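In practice, a research group might receive sequence data for several interacting partners and want a quick structural hypothesis before committing to experiments. The following worked case mirrors that situation: the sequences arrive first, and a predicted assembly follows.
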Amino acid sequence: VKVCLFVADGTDEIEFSAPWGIFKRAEIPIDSVYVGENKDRLVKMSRDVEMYANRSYKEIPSADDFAKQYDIAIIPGGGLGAKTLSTTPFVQQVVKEFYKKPNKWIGMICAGPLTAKTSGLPNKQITGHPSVRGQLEEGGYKYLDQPVVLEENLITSQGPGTAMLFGLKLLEQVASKDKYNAVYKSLSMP
Amino acid sequence: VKVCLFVADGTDEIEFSAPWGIFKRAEIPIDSVYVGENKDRLVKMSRDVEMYANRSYKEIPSADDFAKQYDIAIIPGGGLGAKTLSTTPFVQQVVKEFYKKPNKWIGMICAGPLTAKTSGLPNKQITGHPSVRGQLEEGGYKYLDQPVVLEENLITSQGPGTAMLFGLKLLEQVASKDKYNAVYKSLSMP
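A structural hypothesis for the assembly, expressed as tokens:
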């Protein structure tokens, strides 16, 4: 299994770091894939961290090619970062391609779940940050107030406070029982 | 109030990002201050993120000068990062100077709390990652198996899973109840 963690200028640091650190501990390959223009793949995160991404999305010609490279696509939040990711045709295409595939999984957290709306996904239930609840309900979604929601192969989550639970829920779909339990135990979850 | 988040090569991404994002949301100034060899302030984090720190500690001419600049010192974990930070005299000097001083605060998470022993702090209790429990109790500290411990003005915490509770506990000491509650509410804590 290989994971793509999307990142844009304005992506939240907490929501990036949680799945990143969880999949690294699991020894499951994960790449950060930048949606933006900086030619060195240098990203300015939501709260001003400057960090390098592994790849640019420009390296991947299509969603069909993306699907041959990755099994999990993760769309983190942060207000600005989510606006960019949710409005990028490539990301929407990946989301549409992965939705309901038996060997693929999509995660969206915080304002990330706006990408379900923009990709036209027909899932019934969803969650996200309370600040985008109105926007999600306009689209026709049933907002649930809980840390993590799963519908088909789409996992959604609320906020920086739930980023660890969100990363774990993604890992749960792909890790063996023993790998999941070992990674979980290593985190000192409260 | 002005916070220093220490960072080294091998610092854990999750434990850096939680206090960082929390203090940023609180609109409390926070600098990342790198301890290491890289002259460009490029840090290779525990799980391979490459990120720029705002400052090098070599910009700050003494621990007394550090105390003139910062009110809170935070020591994140990650094996290698905590090994480096805990064994840097500048960091130990800052921790010693800040301990039990009015309106200063120290936080250490995961392996970070090894810095209490190397600095000779006379706190009675502590927590930290279960992986370092022995090494902590070897310094004469009583280990508490709970997410966060506060003793005098020293906050210690267990692991990546507790990084958000850790950042919050630091914030709680310095923000008004009103500000704290607003920041808390924004996080969607589970």
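Before designing any experiment, note the following. Chain B touches chain A at residues 12-14, 16-18, 20-21, 24-25, 32, 46-52, 129-130, 147, 158-162, 164-165, 186-190 (CB under 8 Å). The helical segments of chain B are 13-25, 63-69, 79-86, 89-98, 114-119, 133-137, 163-174, 177-186.
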